[PDB]
Ligand binder design. Structure first.
Ligand SMILES: [Mn+2]
Ligand SMILES: [Zn+2]
Length: 209
């Protein structure tokens, strides 16, 4: 009967921040990592420009390393300071019966189900791969400063020929670029809902004991 990980004052700061969301606005959600073990989560409301964006340390390092190599390029060492319990706390605070839009609803559905949020309705936009990435370059160009976490070289698995590096997948850039694909364009200021010191715990020196 408590929210694990966060103290009450942190939780209230989070709940107040989540009230910045318009409960009825189009809201995209995207994750990196499998829904059972997500490492990056984003929600985005293009109307206001509000976005939720945070990270989580993986339970399964082996699968994480595969995903880093072939999908997201996140270095696990940059996840050590993430706030335990944050994913559950954020999802708990989403408005009841909210409608969320996503590209491929299977993984979002599983994540929300695991949090007991079957009340949330999902719209699967079902863009083709090519259509979904139309604005990929434009989105990184404009918004790269919003996520510096994709540091690793990401590759395409190939049977022959040379190495092929690809642009890493970011949950936040995904939301923005999928919305742009649906809207037929990418307008030129977004606003973070969560405080930086909530997403990452400040690290300090220690003597190892
Ligand atoms: Mn994604
Ligand atoms: Zn990212």
């Amino acid at each position: 009967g408590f929210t694990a990980g966060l103290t009450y004052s942190q939780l209230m700061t989070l709940k107040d921040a989540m009230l910045q969301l318009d409960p009825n606005a189009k809201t995209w959600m995207d994750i990196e990592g499998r829904p059972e073990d997500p490492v990056e989560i984003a929600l985005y409301q293009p109307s206001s420009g509000c976005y939720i964006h945070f990270f989580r340390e993986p339970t399964d390092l082996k699968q994480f390393k595969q995903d880093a190599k072939y999908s997201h390029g996140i270095d696990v060492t940059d996840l050590f300071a993430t706030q335990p319990g944050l994913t559950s706390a954020v999802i708990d605070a989403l408005p009841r019966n909210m409608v969320i839009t996503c590209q491929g609803s299977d993984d979002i559905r599983k994540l929300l189900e695991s949090q007991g949020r079957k009340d949330i309705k999902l719209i699967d936009i079902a863009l083709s791969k090519t259509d979904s990435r139309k604005y990929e370059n434009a989105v990184w160009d404009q918004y790269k400063d919003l996520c510096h976490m994709h540091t690793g070289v990401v590759v395409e698995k190939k049977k022959r020929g040379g190495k092929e590096e690809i642009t890493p997948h970011c949950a936040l850039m995904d939301c923005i670029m999928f919305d742009a694909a649906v809207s037929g364009g990418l307008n030129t200021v977004l606003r973070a809902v969560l405080p930086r010191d909530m997403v990452f715990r400040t690290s300090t020196p220690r003597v190892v004991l």
